[PDB]
Amino acid sequence: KVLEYKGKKLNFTPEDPAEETIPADELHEHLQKPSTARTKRLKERCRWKHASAGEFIEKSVTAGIERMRYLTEAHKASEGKPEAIRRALGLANVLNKSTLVLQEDEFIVGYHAEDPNMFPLYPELSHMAVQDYLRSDYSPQPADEAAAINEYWKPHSLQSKCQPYFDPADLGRMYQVSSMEAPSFASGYNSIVPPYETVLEDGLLARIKLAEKHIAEAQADMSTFPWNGTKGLDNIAKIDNWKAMVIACKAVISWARRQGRLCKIVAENFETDPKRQAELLEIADICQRIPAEPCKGLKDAMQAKFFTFLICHAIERYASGYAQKEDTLLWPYYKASVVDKKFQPMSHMDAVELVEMERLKISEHGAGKSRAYREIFPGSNDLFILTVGGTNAKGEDACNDMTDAILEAAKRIRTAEPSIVFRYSKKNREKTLRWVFECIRDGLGYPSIKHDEIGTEQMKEYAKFSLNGNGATDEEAHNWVNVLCMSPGIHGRRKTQKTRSEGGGSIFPAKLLEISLNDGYDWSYADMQLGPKTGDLSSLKSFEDVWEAFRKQYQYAINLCISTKDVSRYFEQRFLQMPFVSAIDDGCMELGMDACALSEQPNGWHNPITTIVAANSLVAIKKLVFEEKKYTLEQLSQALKANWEGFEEMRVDFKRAPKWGNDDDYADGIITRFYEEIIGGEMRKITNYSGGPVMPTGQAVGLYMEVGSRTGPTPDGRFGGEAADDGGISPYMGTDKKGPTAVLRSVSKVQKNQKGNLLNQRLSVPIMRSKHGFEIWNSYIKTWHDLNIDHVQFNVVSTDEMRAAQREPEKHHDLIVRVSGYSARFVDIPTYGQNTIIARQEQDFSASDLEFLNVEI
Amino acid sequence: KVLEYKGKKLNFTPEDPAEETIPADELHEHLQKPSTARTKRLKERCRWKHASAGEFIEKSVTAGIERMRYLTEAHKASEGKPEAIRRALGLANVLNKSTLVLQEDEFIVGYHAEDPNMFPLYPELSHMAVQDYLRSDYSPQPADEAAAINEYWKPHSLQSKCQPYFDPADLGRMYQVSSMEAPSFASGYNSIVPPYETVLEDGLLARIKLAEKHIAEAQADMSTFPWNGTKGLDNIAKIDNWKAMVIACKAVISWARRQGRLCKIVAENFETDPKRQAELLEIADICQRIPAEPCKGLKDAMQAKFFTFLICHAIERYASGYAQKEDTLLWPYYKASVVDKKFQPMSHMDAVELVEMERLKISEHGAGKSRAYREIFPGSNDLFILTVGGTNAKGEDACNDMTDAILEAAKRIRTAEPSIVFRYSKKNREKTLRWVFECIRDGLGYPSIKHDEIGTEQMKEYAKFSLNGNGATDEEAHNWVNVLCMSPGIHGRRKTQKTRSEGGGSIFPAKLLEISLNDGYDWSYADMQLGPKTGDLSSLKSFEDVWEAFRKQYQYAINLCISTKDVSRYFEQRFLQMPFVSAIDDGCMELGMDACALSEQPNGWHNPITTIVAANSLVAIKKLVFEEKKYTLEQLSQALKANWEGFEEMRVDFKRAPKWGNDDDYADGIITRFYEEIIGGEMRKITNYSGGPVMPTGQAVGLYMEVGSRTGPTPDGRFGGEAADDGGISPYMGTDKKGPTAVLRSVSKVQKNQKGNLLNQRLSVPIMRSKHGFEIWNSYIKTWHDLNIDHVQFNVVSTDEMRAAQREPEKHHDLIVRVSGYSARFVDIPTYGQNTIIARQEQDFSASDLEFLNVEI
Amino acid sequence: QNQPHTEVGTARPCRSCKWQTPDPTDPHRGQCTANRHAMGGVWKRWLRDVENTTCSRHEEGKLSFRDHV
Amino acid sequence: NQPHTEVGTARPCRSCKWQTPDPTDPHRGQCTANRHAMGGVWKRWLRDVENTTCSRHEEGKLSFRDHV
Amino acid sequence: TCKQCANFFPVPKDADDYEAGKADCVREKEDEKGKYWLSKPIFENSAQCEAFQTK
Amino acid sequence: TCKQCANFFPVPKDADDYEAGKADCVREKEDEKGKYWLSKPIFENSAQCEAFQTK
Numbered sequence A, B: 001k002v003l004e005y006k007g008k009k010l011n012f013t014p015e016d017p018a019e020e021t022i023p024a025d026e027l028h029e030h031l032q033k034p035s036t037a038r039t040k041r042l043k044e045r046c047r048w049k050h051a052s053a054g055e056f057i058e059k060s061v062t063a064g065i066e067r068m069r070y071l072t073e074a075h076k077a078s079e080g081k082p083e084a085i086r087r088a089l090g091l092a093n094v095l096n097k098s099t100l101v102l103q104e105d106e107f108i109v110g111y112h113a114e115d116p117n118m119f120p121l122y123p124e125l126s127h128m129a130v131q132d133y134l135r136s137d138y139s140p141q142p143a144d145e146a147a148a149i150n151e152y153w154k155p156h157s158l159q160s161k162c163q164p165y166f167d168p169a170d171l172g173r174m175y176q177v178s179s180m181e182a183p184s185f186a187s188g189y190n191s192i193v194p195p196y197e198t199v200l201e202d203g204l205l206a207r208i209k210l211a212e213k214h215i216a217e218a219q220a221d222m223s224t225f226p227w228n229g230t231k232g233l234d235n236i237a238k239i240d241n242w243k244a245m246v247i248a249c250k251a252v253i254s255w256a257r258r259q260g261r262l263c264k265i266v267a268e269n270f271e272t273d274p275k276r277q278a279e280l281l282e283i284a285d286i287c288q289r290i291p292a293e294p295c296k297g298l299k300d301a302m303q304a305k306f307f308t309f310l311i312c313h314a315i316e317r318y319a320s321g322y323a324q325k326e327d328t329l330l331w332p333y334y335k336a337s338v339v340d341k342k343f344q345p346m347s348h349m350d351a352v353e354l355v356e357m358e359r360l361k362i363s364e365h366g367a368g369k370s371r372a373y374r375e376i377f378p379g380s381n382d383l384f385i386l387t388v389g390g391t392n393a394k395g396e397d398a399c400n401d402m403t404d405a406i407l408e409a410a411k412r413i414r415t416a417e418p419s420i421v422f423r424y425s426k427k428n429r430e431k432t433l434r435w436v437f438e439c440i441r442d443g444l445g446y447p448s449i450k451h452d453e454i455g456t457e458q459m460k461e462y463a464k465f466s467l468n469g470n471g472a473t474d475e476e477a478h479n480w481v482n483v484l485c486m487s488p489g490i491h492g493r494r495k496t497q498k499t500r501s502e503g504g505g506s507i508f509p510a511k512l513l514e515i516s517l518n519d520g521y522d523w524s525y526a527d528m529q530l531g532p533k534t535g536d537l538s539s540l541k542s543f544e545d546v547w548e549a550f551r552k553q554y555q556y557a558i559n560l561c562i563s564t565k566d567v568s569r570y571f572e573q574r575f576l577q578m579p580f581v582s583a584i585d586d587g588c589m590e591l592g593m594d595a596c597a598l599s600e601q602p603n604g605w606h607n608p609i610t611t612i613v614a615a616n617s618l619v620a621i622k623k624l625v626f627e628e629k630k631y632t633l634e635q636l637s638q639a640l641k642a643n644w645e646g647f648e649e650m651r652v653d654f655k656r657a658p659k660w661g662n663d664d665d666y667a668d669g670i671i672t673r674f675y676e677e678i679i680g681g682e683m684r685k686i687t688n689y690s691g692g693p694v695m696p697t698g699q700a701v702g703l704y705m706e707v708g709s710r711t712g713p714t715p716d717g718r719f720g721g722e723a724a725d726d727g728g729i730s731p732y733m734g735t736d737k738k739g740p741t742a743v744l745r746s747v748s749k750v751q752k753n754q755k756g757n758l759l760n761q762r763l764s765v766p767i768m769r770s771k772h773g774f775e776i777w778n779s780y781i782k783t784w785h786d787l788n789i790d791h792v793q794f795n796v797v798s799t800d801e802m803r804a805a806q807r808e809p810e811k812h813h814d815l816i817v818r819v820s821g822y823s824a825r826f827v828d829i830p831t832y833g834q835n836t837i838i839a840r841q842e843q844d845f846s847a848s849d850l851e852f853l854n855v856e857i
Numbered sequence C: 001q002n003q004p005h006t007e008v009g010t011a012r013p014c015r016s017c018k019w020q021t022p023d024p025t026d027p028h029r030g031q032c033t034a035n036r037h038a039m040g041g042v043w044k045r046w047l048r049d050v051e052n053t054t055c056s057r058h059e060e061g062k063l064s065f066r067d068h069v
Numbered sequence D: 001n002q003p004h005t006e007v008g009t010a011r012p013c014r015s016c017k018w019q020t021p022d023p024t025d026p027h028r029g030q031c032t033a034n035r036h037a038m039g040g041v042w043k044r045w046l047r048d049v050e051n052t053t054c055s056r057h058e059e060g061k062l063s064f065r066d067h068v
Numbered sequence E, F: 001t002c003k004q005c006a007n008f009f010p011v012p013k014d015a016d017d018y019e020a021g022k023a024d025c026v027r028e029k030e031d032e033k034g035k036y037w038l039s040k041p042i043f044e045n046s047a048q049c050e051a052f053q054t055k
């Protein structure tokens, strides 16, 4: 294109001139540049386990059975013992009897199943999930033994413990995933923020010694005259917890050392290449010393990180995510290895190759989650979200050479997972910002940008509610990462989030609006009463009546949402203890408590998904039905029940009604109230297990497509089964004609009672691949920061490339797009989601847009 | 004899003149006078299950299996459910599948085993006890099924839960029952004070309705917007507890009604006598309405009382005792039936016959306790101790016609159990007092006397320490009964003691003094180190050094005792819930808590047994070893290791040293310091689970025989294996040579830091059985009350009748004697205990003795 | 007719129909995706019973992931 | 005359008439064979009733009257 | 074959513990002490024992 | 059997997981993606598998 700006003629020609000789519909097939030949071979040989539409993309991926079998064995043997010690014994049995895997060209080693094409299962979490796996084509084998395991675990499963405290009608409404996401105890889905810092600094031997010292001190206190029954009995649970930590840590050390032994055996007996043999011996020594001893170099740190990830996200319990401050966590070891060359001496490109291998190992991590969460992350194994950038405790820029290494590896290897979040501050140096823009302009979809000051202030605010008064300090508040996709949380040796029961889960306003217009009866999907009987159409005489009906629906739904999580946490700390995670947490170790019992930092939240559809529907109802009396509510209900068939003129009238993201005063006025007074305002009144408030972390993450299919037609003009809004604050597909700046100003208006909101923006490809684009992108980020919007993520892919990919998937396998909250391989996304992504407006910048953005060419 | 008193001539000739025509060696065989022929038939055919030396006296008594069988089934089926609901389900299964028993001539019906000659067992409490039962001749059958049941229960037993938290050496020291009684979790022994008042006043249907109302309110609170995670989760345990209460109460109602149905069936199909048929129909209707509905008459009250006792002491859990304020509890229904004749009209003699039948039913109650407690209550089924007399809330006399009916039934029917405790006050009317003296003069040993004011002040003082501020009020403090033998505790609808973990268990000073003289090494019994190494003999240079060595031993032992009890309670409330007891407690029902969790009234205590042996030994050590330097500590130790062989002169010198109970200033000074500074002083430093102090309740209860047989020779003059003192404060047998008044003054000297001290005294037969008996006994009790002595109990038996019963046991079946805190059939006591009882000094009253007592003829 | 109906022990269950995908939470339930609007919407219907339910549009087989949501 | 350990003895302490099982642990025992002339029954503790014997071993079992 | 015993007394339908086919097996016994009666819950179709009285 | 396999590597005495007779069964496996190795804990006395190579 060509833009006239302040007299200058801006030519949007790709920086690399050779890009003029590459066709536009295959561009992304020529952008990957693996740093070494080893990472190229690894990218070609990668065992991707992406999942979509509830099934796995590849026929080679199948569930394992070793974890179920060994956990069941240990549980049958540990009857009568303290539940924490029983959990430690279960983890120990799984780790001691599991098959270990070593693949060719690997440097970071380790796996979470008995075979590199498999993934573990979790019969202790949700028996319905294992039952769904048994009925699936990728079931664990032998099938009868897995069925016996599930039948044994059903009475002890977390689902069976949590369900007796709720109306079966409520749970039936929840499990439909239409107006409310199913509770985590019914699905087994979870998240965690592991304290990698403790593992990397201390080593597990130190944690064992600490737990043993505490045990001896407690036993001596129990034998101290004179005994005090009102204080001494507190030592029983502490001793149980500390013994569980010792068992789990000894098991993990033995497990890592057996992996190193496998490395040495393959070096001495199976491998022919002497270079490969020497490398295997080096890895074997690493796994020998790590994680028993503190980390001394960067390779030590990365191997320890991967071991801790395997235990905290796959083996001890299932937990989605990849939460960590990778650059801050790895910087001391980068300085030891690359800068100072004191232990494991390497160059910067060596660290780049190491991060490449880390990304590929994560790309091979199959997640044994339930069907619901094999549906809502199309085109990816799971959610893997790390955080870099930000500010330190003294408010100075936290960017370093390790951030640049991570970003360069992510740009070179072009893998969808793990996704990256960059906490942006004005303090952030321009070199790292150029690397972030390098990743974004290549269409990877990451790093997403988050407002650093907003997150730090949020951490400070939540810390005030701490039950033991040990919330994050003002200095600790700067050390935060995204828990899964969008919600900030503390990272470090202490006070990190340990379960999704603390925060997470979704509520869907679109279905709530639909049933508000039908007295709480979901006729479109389940033909059943999905909500309270807020009133028939004759009762909704004023717009305020519809507003209050939605308020009642929202209150009922969100109350169930948070209460299920708190009950899940109650039973998690009593029967689903994580002694290993508790061992590497300084607070759990000091207090002798389980990771789920102790909660020094509140972070309660819930995700409103499909908010903008309901908001636009409300704006259209107020505009046409009530204010202008052009259509009656009964006419609208008759048309909606008809799926707009024979009412097409009315459907277009409602579609053209004022919409979010056009800087429209009418639509934005109502929708800002909807966000702050209802979506955030009513949810804020709820208090969670930690004593903090629950605030909305708006996002969509694929559910927007699944919920929309389950949702019926809406006054917004959507037909039934049409996809909902892509992002929580994002404008709906093809509803924005005023350009990017107008969308930014609409997003700017909602500043109250939101813990986070997700904005998805599609930027023009020519401007981005042009030299002018980094300056435009920096200007947008600076305006967005001054606007105080919480988050922004960018997709830069031509429709032509995507349409070609739909027609020829094998040709377009390299291309990566961004769905909301994460990045996916386009060819692995179903046509439904691909079309929702294609229909996102590719935003072009005018002269007035740049003038608003304060661009200086 | 004939004693001249102040010039008047007192001749001690029996009131009954036929006693001059009965020879003195068979007297007590001709005193029983059953009120009706039915109770006479019941007395002749009574199925006594007396126990001695750890075995059962009769070969017809054998263990049952139904309780073990059905509890095991219910526990296997209830896995995964809340532990309280699991306990309720176990009780429900036992009650629903149990065989019910109806015997001839019974009016109060009901049993706790499948056969009238059998008793239940408790595999959930202590697996060692069940193992001991399996190796016994009275083992449950089939033996292999019982062994499999114990193998199933071992990992889940309470003993297995408590043992991991103590040094195995410490537990090994306790389990010998030599210096410290074994902890209740190791034996299964227990006690309880049931809230009979709630059952008799409300009926279980009301409790079920109340629990269901609470459940509904809690669930509605859990679904109330907005949810509060710091408050709503408290409802989970409450709902679990209330549902367990509903299950248990419905089971008990169904069980009682099935018993009534058995009565009706036997009336309609098996019985020929029309009088018996009508009686059976009456009992059947009673069991239909009782305990589902409130009691309306005296028969209702007695049947309900017996059912509640069966559940609280045998079926839901083992619990020794018969704790209740029987006259106060039964008075409204006696007044309804006998005085006002409003429902179930009866005469006074009818109530006497009813209490007779109750006493015989208790005489048929076999206790499935462990071997240790089949050893230490020789000559009785178990401990059954009820309390009558006392004062009401206003401080007025609590004696009534029901008290006299109970005492009259105890007088005519001559059964050892239940024993009676009479709380004495100056307010007590003279009519009841003679009924008390009527029982005592017959040699029954009961009713025992307790100081009312001391108990009431004790309840107030303990109430101050209540954790939730709901201790007994000053009015409630007057309503107290003995828990087992000697310790006061609140009775009523609320705040009653629910487990022996609150108070109970024993510690033995004689063995402690022995090991103090041997650096903590038990050479005499086990050849093992039983206590801390307080010091060798050359280190004990001062008498104060010996004192301090004993203090260190005592502190170690008492700390172990109280800590074992509190750990037992922790695991009782977590895995041994008693939902039925919780249902009939107003506090547990109101708060939705288990009977073992809630402790609104502290009552902590421990029993020092064999105190006077240690006290006299210390007095003799100071006398001869230090003050007179006649023997060195090494000479004394050499004599002890030789069992005084060749050291007889030394043995007589130590025996002739000043002893307790002779009003010796030297001995009483040292022993009073011993009681107040060490026995009471060190124990109160310890605080129990309820937050109250732990105070000594001195008593022997037969343990004195066993511990003496396990104790080596002592400086008091004992040979190895000889029995110790028979009470908490009683003088050692045959060591009091100054008459009864000197014993009274000595006992009165001890006033600080005690919760109770048992006093055994033997009064002369002619004086008590003469027409002057009451006046002398009343003067004795009046002076004993003015001397502020805690307790006294009497034996009225001549040595000749006891020797004749030893020679001709088959002709003295109705001879009843008093041991310590309980009464036993003399012929069922082993020769060892019989000889200890015979050797007690039969005291006689001089002129000066009566003058001290203010006897006015 | 074309809408689902109950048939006890039917030979053509929703379980074997290509338009069905198991429920996200309860594998005993299902989602019928046979109502495909011309504008791309997949108007799913909930299925309480996947073993004894059928309609006229029953087709044995299984769609690829591209044809599901 | 003192108790000694004999592996699998033909006459264990368990079957001796002078023995009564331990009050807490049936694997232990109480030897009541040292009866003083003055009435004392000086019991001695037995760690193992399965592999122990002395010279005074007499198979049988006293009545309760002869025990403590 | 545990239904036509003379000791088979069906539980009334109005009883709290009533189940389909449940009944009380009530027998009489006597030893040297006295005479008693035992009521055990059994079912209509159940195993018969040695003491089956006809009708 | 299952002891003289070329895939039978006895666990070193000093290893944290050492037991009497324990060993690693280490195989090399290859599909369309790549070549990997599997190490499962077995014992000297254990059942052999389909592919036994003599050491």
Ligand SMILES: O=C(O)/C=C/C(=O)O
Pocket (backbone or CB within 6 Å): A191, A482, A483, A484, A485, A486, A487, A488, A500, A503, A504, A505, A506, A607, A697, A699
């Ligand atoms: O756990 C969740 O549901 C979401 C987390 C996030 O988006 O941060």
Ligand SMILES: O=C(O)/C=C/C(=O)O
Pocket (backbone or CB within 6 Å): B191, B482, B483, B484, B485, B486, B487, B488, B500, B503, B504, B505, B506, B607, B697, B699
């Ligand atoms: O339970 C005990 O050891 C004693 C109780 C009492 O004497 O009340």
Ligand code: SF4
Pocket (backbone or CB within 6 Å): C003, C004, C005, C012, C013, C014, C015, C017, C018, C019, C020, C031, C032, C033, C034, C053, C054, C055, C056, C057, C058, C059
């Ligand atoms: S049989 Fe009919 S209702 Fe069932 S899944 Fe197939 S199309 Fe849907």
Ligand code: SF4
Pocket (backbone or CB within 6 Å): D002, D003, D012, D013, D016, D017, D018, D019, D030, D031, D032, D033, D052, D053, D054, D055, D056, D057, D058
């Ligand atoms: S064999 Fe000897 S030591 Fe053993 S019980 Fe008999 S007398 Fe005692």
Ligand code: SF4
Pocket (backbone or CB within 6 Å): E002, E005, E006, E007, E008, E025, E026, E027, E042, E047, E048, E049, E050, E051, E052, E053
């Ligand atoms: S159990 Fe025996 S006695 Fe009872 S009803 Fe059946 S066959 Fe008759």
Ligand code: SF4
Pocket (backbone or CB within 6 Å): F002, F003, F005, F006, F007, F008, F025, F026, F027, F047, F048, F049, F050, F051, F052, F053
């Ligand atoms: S399992 Fe097979 S490959 Fe492994 S050691 Fe045994 S025979 Fe060899």
